[PDB]
Write a protein that binds this DNA or RNA. Structure first.
Ligand SMILES: [Mn+2]
Ligand SMILES: [Mn+2]
Ligand SMILES: [Mn+2]
Ligand SMILES: [Mn+2]
Ligand SMILES: [Mn+2]
Ligand SMILES: [Mn+2]
Ligand SMILES: [Mn+2]
Length: 204
DNA sequence: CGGTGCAACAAATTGATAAGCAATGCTTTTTTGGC
DNA sequence: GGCCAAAAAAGCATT
DNA sequence: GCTTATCAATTTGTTGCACC
């Protein structure tokens, strides 16, 4: 129960036959690079499905129509893996994990009245080291926002005196930014095996 | 290529609970690039 | 697309 | 071990992107 970058490119390849696999493969790598770049240096404001497609056009010389179907399928395939209970591991970027959470005490932050947090399965993203280095090294760029999938942004870490957990020796750590992913509604619903029933949908 | 509309976003409240992380060497998985 | 040895990244330890 | 994230219900303002 684990999907990799290559296993993902393989499924996107056998679903994009009208496109040469090598291009299907080059595409995913360009997307992930465009994505890392955005979070690391940014420069071009928020990243979106359109910017990722335009980029594949410019860069790979792909039809604007194919870059769009691909970008969409790329994230669709990831959702399919997770919804099926599979962990998605994209080397050089990060891993999308599934966690079963038990019910725990909550409340209406405004009123204060206790209201329990139901048990559920969530999608979490663990930034890889390759990526974490780029974001602290570069300094921090823009966010990524893909509706229905999730959004990536940067959270700030204040400087602090840390310890080498092996030796217990103190270490002086500088401020830096770290990537943070937020699963979008579609992905949370599909991945959470506790809501595939008559939904939540009323007006008052 | 450009204008609209609207559900999916971000931010904001509190507080109990769950998850992640500083350094870094050895082990394991993944990818790379030739053939 | 499969093989393969080497390089890179990740996994683990503990994180 | 200490720090950061998770989440509840609900409103106010923003934006990705489907659809003209
Ligand atoms: Mn262009
Ligand atoms: Mn299934
Ligand atoms: Mn955030
Ligand atoms: Mn090589
Ligand atoms: Mn490493
Ligand atoms: Mn252990
Ligand atoms: Mn502990």
């Amino acid at each position: 129960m684990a999907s990799t970058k290559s296993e993902l490119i393989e499924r996107l390849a056998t679903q994009q036959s009208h496109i040469p696999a090598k291009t299907v493969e080059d595409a995913v790598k360009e997307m992930l690079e465009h994505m890392a770049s955005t979070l690391a240096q940014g420069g071009s404001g928020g990243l979106t499905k359109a910017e990722m497609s335009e980029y594949l056009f410019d860069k790979l010389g792909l039809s604007k129509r194919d870059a769009k179907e691909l970008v969409e399928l790329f994230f669709e395939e990831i959702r399919r893996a997770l919804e099926n209970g599979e962990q998605v591991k994209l080397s050089g970027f990060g891993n999308f994990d599934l966690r079963d959470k038990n019910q725990r005490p909550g409340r209406n932050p405004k009123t204060g009245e206790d209201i329990p947090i139901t048990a559920r399965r969530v999608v979490t993203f663990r930034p890889g080291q390759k990526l974490k280095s780029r974001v602290e090294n570069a300094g921090g760029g823009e966010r990524i926002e893909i509706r229905g999938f999730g959004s990536f942004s940067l959270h700030y870490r204040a400087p602090r005196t840390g310890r080498n957990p092996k030796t217990g020796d103190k270490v002086e750590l500088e401020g830096k930014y770290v990537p943070h992913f937020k699963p979008g509604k579609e992905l949370r619903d599909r991945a959470n095996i506790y809501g595939g029933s008559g939904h939540h949908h009323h007006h008052h």
